[PDB]
Amino acid sequence: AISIKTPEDIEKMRVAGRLAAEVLEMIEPYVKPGVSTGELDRICNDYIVNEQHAVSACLGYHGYPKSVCISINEVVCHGIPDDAKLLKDGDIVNIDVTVIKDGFHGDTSKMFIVGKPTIMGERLCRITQESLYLALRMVKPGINLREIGAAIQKFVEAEGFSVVREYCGHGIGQGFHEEPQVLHYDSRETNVVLKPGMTFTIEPMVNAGKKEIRTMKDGWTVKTKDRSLSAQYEHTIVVTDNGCEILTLRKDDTIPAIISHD
Ligand SMILES: CCCC[C@H](N)P(=O)(O)O
Ligand SMILES: [Co+2]
Ligand SMILES: [Co+2]
Ligand code: NA
Numbered sequence: 001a002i003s004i005k006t007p008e009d010i011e012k013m014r015v016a017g018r019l020a021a022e023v024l025e026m027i028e029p030y031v032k033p034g035v036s037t038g039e040l041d042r043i044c045n046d047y048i049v050n051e052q053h054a055v056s057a058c059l060g061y062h063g064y065p066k067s068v069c070i071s072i073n074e075v076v077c078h079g080i081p082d083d084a085k086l087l088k089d090g091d092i093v094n095i096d097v098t099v100i101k102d103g104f105h106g107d108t109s110k111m112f113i114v115g116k117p118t119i120m121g122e123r124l125c126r127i128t129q130e131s132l133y134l135a136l137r138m139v140k141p142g143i144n145l146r147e148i149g150a151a152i153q154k155f156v157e158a159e160g161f162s163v164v165r166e167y168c169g170h171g172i173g174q175g176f177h178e179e180p181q182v183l184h185y186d187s188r189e190t191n192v193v194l195k196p197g198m199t200f201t202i203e204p205m206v207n208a209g210k211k212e213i214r215t216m217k218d219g220w221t222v223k224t225k226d227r228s229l230s231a232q233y234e235h236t237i238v239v240t241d242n243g244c245e246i247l248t249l250r251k252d253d254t255i256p257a258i259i260s261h262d
Contacts, residue, residue: 002171002179004197009173010238012104013199017236017247019052020099020106023068025250033089033115037070040095041081044068048099057098057105057176064220069096069109076205076213076222076230077167089115092125094232098176105172107201108248109234120208120229127159128206128231133255135202139237139244140261143194150186152204164205164230166213167222171200172236194239199247203234 005013023044030043045067048054056067071079071094072087079094087093096109111125134155135148156163169182180192184204209228216223224230236247243259 005199012102016101016104016106019054019101020097020108021248021250023097031112035087036083037081037085038083041066055100057100073229074224074227078220087114090118092121105176107236111231124208124231129233131155131204132233141194141196145192146190149183153185156206162207162211169201169203173199196239196241198239201236205232
């Protein structure tokens with residue numbers, strides 16, 4: 001049930017991927033102390049709809065009431081935007097976007113540091129991105145996804161942090177969440193060999209503290225059990241003949257779009 005994309009399919013994901021990356025690049029100037037998450041959400045939505053002529057995949061998904069996910073500090077993921085939640089100096093915030101264009105999905109997220117960063121915040125964001133980059137560098141045909149989850153874990157743990165088990169990367173295409181489940185840790189349950197034409201996301205969530213998490217009464221919001229800060233980055237990629245191509249690459253990414261093995 002793992003869908004293999006045709007080249008035409010891939011051309012469309014490249015567009016959707018770029019659109020999604022673009023929302024992230026666009027929003028940056030608005031991320032400042034005093035802005036509410038509800039306003040960031042509206043700016044995004046407007047852009048998506050009125051400028052891009054695309055659609056947010058989040059709006060209505062299983063009942064999701066907003067256009068993007070905004071997770072502050074200890075919120076792990078799926079934080080709900082709100083007019084009352086204002087950003088302060090030193091906050092670390094994840095903005096997660098998923099756009100639909102020509103029926104294809106593009107899913108990506110990045111951390112933003114509000115005003116003057118904290119040492120921990122900065123550190124955690126860095127290590128989290130590096131862990132995603134590490135995984136990307138390993139992607140190529142013939143390798144088992146298991147090896148990827150394991151390298152991520154090993155890296156993160158050596159850096160004194162913890163990896164969230166409960167949520168993971170996923171296949172993506174015409175469908176928002178397709179097979180397979182991309183675990184960010186070492187698990188004997190994982191046994192998936194990569195092949196060209198496969199499209200999925202890698203989106204490790206790392207905790208400054210302990211790995212444990214808790215779901216809010218809102219049924220969306222996830223927070224760390226120990227209230228420590230949590231960070232995440234996400235990219236959508238396609239497995240190529242000799243490596244991978246990052247479909248959601250941004251101007252600020254410091255990794256090449258095409259990774260080649262030889
Ligand atoms: C409404 C659920 C939002 C899904 C997230 N973009 P992900 O698939 O990265 O967890
Ligand atoms: Co995703
Ligand atoms: Co996402
Ligand atoms: Na967070």
